[PDB]
Design a protein around this nucleic acid. Structure first.
Lengths: 100, 63, 91, 77, 50, 50, 112
RNA sequence: CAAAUGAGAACUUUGAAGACUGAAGUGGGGAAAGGUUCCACGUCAACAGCAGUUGGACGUGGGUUAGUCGAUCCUAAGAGAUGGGGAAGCUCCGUUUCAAAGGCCUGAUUUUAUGCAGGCCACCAUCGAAAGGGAAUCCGGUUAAGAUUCCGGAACCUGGAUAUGGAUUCUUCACGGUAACGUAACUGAAUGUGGAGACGUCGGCGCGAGCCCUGGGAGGAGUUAUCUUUUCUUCUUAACAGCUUAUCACCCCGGAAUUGGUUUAUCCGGAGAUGGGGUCUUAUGGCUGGAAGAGGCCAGCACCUUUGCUGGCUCCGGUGCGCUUGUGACGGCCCGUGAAAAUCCACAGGAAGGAAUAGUUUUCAUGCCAGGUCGUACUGAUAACCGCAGCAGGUCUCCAAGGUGAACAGCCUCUAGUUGAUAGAAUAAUGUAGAUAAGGGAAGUCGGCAAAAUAGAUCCGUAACUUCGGGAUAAGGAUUGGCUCUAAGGGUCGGGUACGAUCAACUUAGAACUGGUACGGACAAGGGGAAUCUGACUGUCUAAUUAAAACAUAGCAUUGCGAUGGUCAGAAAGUGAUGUUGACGCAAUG
RNA sequence: GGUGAACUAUGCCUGAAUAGGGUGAAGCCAGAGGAAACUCUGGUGGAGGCUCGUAGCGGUUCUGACGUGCAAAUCGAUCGU
């Protein structure tokens, strides 16, 4: 019901390739994720955390892997990382970024 | 987006009507909705005991 | 509610066929579409299926009768006549 | 196919001496989100019917599969 | 038609078997004037109309 | 094709155990499930066959 | 929307050729063939629907057991309870009428 | 446009674009018809009115798998032997009539035998429908091509055979319920009866299925100068088995005017309604089994080795005058009342048979065997059919997405399909098709012929005449866009023993603001009035020059006929139509 | 002396097909007027060999196109239903 949903993003491969920085990535998430459609509603309901190689988001309010993929794709297009990085799902809410 | 606009009430003026009033929404179905609503309310009142069977019957004929 | 002055059931025919023909058809059409008493059960439930077929739906019965009326004046007259003759023969 | 919900009726069915093969199908079923349990289905193959006995208890399933005689052709999947 | 009878099926089978060009060794047999199958049929050209 | 109703009537076969159905022309006032009588000694009633 | 097709060789919307549109485990929509509906058996006296009896086609009646084709009462699968009761009452009352008429005839013959 | 193949490419193939058909398709199948046109590999002499490397062409081969789909069975309109009667005769009538018209059951139980100590009848050939009736199969996968036919799984019907599980024996063929009725069963011959098969059409209403729409979540793809918790897409459950679910109808209990109940539609109730309780139908829906192991949506790892394997997901909802289909309870219509038969059940009746290890049930469950014969490929049409042809013609039918809009109108798009019609060169006159035009407005012409004008919707208003039903959209006028708002439409939940939240949004009105006074902005969509002749109208005909005032028509009238008859057939007939008829009928006329 | 109802004419038997609107018949419900007789007003309902108009069926006019044609009867617009 009110249980918090946890979404993990594995950025290890792009971090190793040295073209994509998790700090700025999670900063973009924390300033672009919108709850209730406006600003001021992100009162610790949705949180993002960085360990350096994995970005963990916790959401008690509405938030979906579809939204997370949309925001990641938007960030990648902004920073011109498309055609190099694919946002892939391994299992439920345990996404990763791949180079191939 | 257009459906949201219609929901708010736009694009429904005389210059947008092309069918007649009945062709758009039948007066028959409007009457059916009216009579069903009134009959349901009357039956609810009679069952709850707000009005007795005689007043209910008079009101049913009037409806 | 009187929606029409004098055409009655013949408003379906509208304007065609002539006033006199429409009037005759009107008289016979009310006669054929009317509801009649059932002599066996007493309820106004006798409809017409076809000419001479009159079905009472409440008691599930069928009667032989006129094309547009449950009983014709000729039928009543012959009923009285045969009743009179039977009574004379019996007594 | 025919549903089976009674252990003794399944026992008589396997005692019928007309059925030879039973398929033990294991499913991961969810009654409550916090209890993902191991459903199992014993599908006895008759000559005109396939009788699927349903149980939801792992212990009862294990006891039944241990009680099944080894002569019966059991196929686990 | 798709729903035929055995007689029509037999007729079509015979027509199919007949509809072949003549072998080239009958051309080589001596005292022979046959050069081609004059009774050759094509479905568009000639309808047997059975 | 006929302007008059017909009556399916049933009699008992006097010689063998079975029912005989007859197609009469219905007279006015004849109703279903009604006793009609056919014969020389029948009574003068509507539907009888005196 | 996926569109369906007849499975039989009949291309016409006849009565013996009805079709329902059903989705199958393959994820596609196919036109399964639906056939004539059964009508309830009717009483031979009043013609009303005979309650308590299954409504099938005649060959399905052949393959169905006796219990579903009849009721435990007399004239079970042929006539309804009301008709059976009315004919029982008629039988008894008319027999009593006949007996009393017979004794009346006997006594008046003896008197005259 | 490029590339490939090719001697050679406007035409073949692949990719990239641009388009169209736009779900009464240029899509997916079928009927008749065709007969291999289907498919593969070679292949361009002729044909494809240009070309061709391509083909429905040529050469060689492959391909059609059924107990469940059809035929086969039944009978309809009708055709048609037999008996018999005509005819010189080929042959005609006739189909139950003026006929001596005939086959299955416990069966006597052993040399016999549908010869037999026995039994009953009454359709009184046959053919006639690949759209009528009808015993039974679905899902997934598979091919160069076949699949409801093959494979895997899961079922069902018919015919046959037959043994085990389940009720009685000193109540032989059950029990319970008040009753509608209910069970796993729970003998039943002749004989008789009933039901199903088995039915029109239209209108509204209700319910269901599929589709359309829509929210959350899981997984991919598109945009991402900027903005979009964003746009698209997958999230599916078959026949069959069990349990449970409805209208209608029915049963029990009290016995109702102060009439009540009740449908959108006014129909029921002392011949028993409201109310309470219950029974029944398998349409339909739900939960399981089939069955997730299938199929789809993803991610990952081996690696010329007829190439594989793992992991995760496949989940919860909602809405509606929505479209189509089916179903149900109903109403309207008829001087029209909307096949038969095969076949299968059931019921009356009680023949015969049956009892402590022996008998009664194969209409309860399980178990065994078999299900022959022919069709099955493909097109089904601007190229597989017919029209002399690869002919702008004709030819029956099923499924039918989104937007606008009243609308399977017109217009644009999604799935699917096609991009086929000899091509190239800014086009002279005259054409064909589409259009504009100042001022006048029919002065043209036999004639307003052809074009124009009108046009949707909401309001206002609407004459003569009339058969009072119409005329009528009479005639005439006014508004119509966009945006921001406002107000009318609508279910559950109670008081220790005078009252209100979530929850579709789809139809009407009203207001403000705004702009080149534009707003049914494309599409689409009546010109009207005053009179005369004529035919009452609806309808029908000269296929291929005449659609009319001609013909029909209802209405009216006349004539013939009571059956040994009227009218009309046949060469004749023991022959026919009306006639399955009978003056409210048939026939002949105006 | 034979052949044809595969076109077409007509009658049977068995099937199938026919968007959206306009008008608003009977039958019902509720009111109003009047002393009565009776009259009137709203709503419902959804009839018609009615009507506008698709598919369909037909073929008025252009006396349009074509008229050694796509075609020994077709094409387009406009039309009837």
């Amino acid at each position: 019901q009110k249980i918090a949903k946890t979404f993990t993003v594995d950025v290890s491969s792009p971090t190793e390739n040295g073209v994509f920085d998790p700090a700025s990535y999670a900063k973009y998430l924390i300033d672009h994720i919108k709850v209730e459609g406006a600003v001021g509603n992100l009162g610790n309901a949705v949180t993002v955390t960085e360990d350096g190689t994995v970005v963990t988001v916790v959401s008690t309010a509405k938030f979906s892997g579809k939204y997370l993929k949309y925001l990641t794709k938007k960030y990648l297009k902004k920073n011109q990382l498309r055609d190099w990085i694919r946002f892939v799902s391994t299992k439920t809410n345990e996404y990763r970024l791949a180079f191939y | 987006a257009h459906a949201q606009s219609k929901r708010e009430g736009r694009h429904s003026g005389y210059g947008k009507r092309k069918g007649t009033r009945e062709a758009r929404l039948p007066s028959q179905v409007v009457w059916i909705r009216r009579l069903r609503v009134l009959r349901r309310l009357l039956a609810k009142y009679r069952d709850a005991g707000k009005i007795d069977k005689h007043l209910y019957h008079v009101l049913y004929k009037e409806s | 509610a009187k929606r029409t002055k004098k055409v009655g059931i013949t408003g379906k025919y509208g304007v065609r066929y002539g006033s006199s023909l429409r009037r005759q058809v009107k008289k016979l059409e009310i006669q054929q579409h009317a509801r009649y008493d059932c002599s066996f059960c007493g309820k106004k439930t006798v409809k017409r299926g076809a000419a001479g077929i009159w079905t009472c739906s409440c008691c599930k019965k069928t009667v032989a009768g006129g094309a547009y009326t449950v009983s014709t004046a000729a039928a009543a007259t012959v009923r009285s006549t045969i009743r009179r003759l039977r009574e004379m023969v019996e007594a | 196919a025919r549903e089976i919900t009674d252990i003794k009726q399944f026992l008589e069915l396997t005692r019928r001496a007309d059925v030879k093969t039973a398929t033990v199908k294991i499913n991961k079923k969810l009654n409550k989100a916090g209890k993902p349990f191991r459903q199992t289905k014993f599908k006895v193959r008759g000559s005109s019917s396939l009788y699927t006995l349903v149980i939801n208890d792992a212990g009862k399933a294990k006891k039944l599969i241990q009680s099944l005689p080894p002569t019966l052709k059991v196929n686990r999947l | 038609a798709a729903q035929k009878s055995f007689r029509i099926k037999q007729k079509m089978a015979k027509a199919k078997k007949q509809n072949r060009p003549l072998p080239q060794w009958i051309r080589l047999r001596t005292n022979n004037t046959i050069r081609y199958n004059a009774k050759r049929r094509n479905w568009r050209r000639t309808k047997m109309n059975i | 094709g006929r302007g008059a109703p017909l009556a399916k009537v049933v009699f008992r076969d006097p010689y063998k155990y079975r029912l005989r159905e007859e197609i009469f022309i219905a007279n006015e006032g004849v109703h279903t499930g009604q006793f009609i009588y056919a014969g020389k000694k029948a009574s003068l009633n509507v539907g009888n066959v005196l | 929307a996926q569109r369906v097709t007849f499975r039989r060789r009949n291309p016409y919307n006849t009565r013996s050729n009805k079709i329902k549109v059903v989705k199958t485990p393959g994820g596609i929509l196919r036109a399964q063939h639906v056939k004539k509906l059964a009508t309830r058996p009717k009483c031979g006296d009043c013609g009303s629907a005979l309650q308590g009896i299954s409504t099938l086609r005649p060959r399905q009646y052949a393959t169905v057991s006796k219990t579903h084709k009849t009721v435990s009462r007399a004239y079970g699968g042929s006539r309804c309870a009301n008709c059976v009761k009315e004919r029982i009452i008629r039988a008894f009352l008319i027999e009593e009428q006949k007996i009393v008429k017979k004794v009346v005839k006997e006594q008046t013959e003896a008197a005259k």
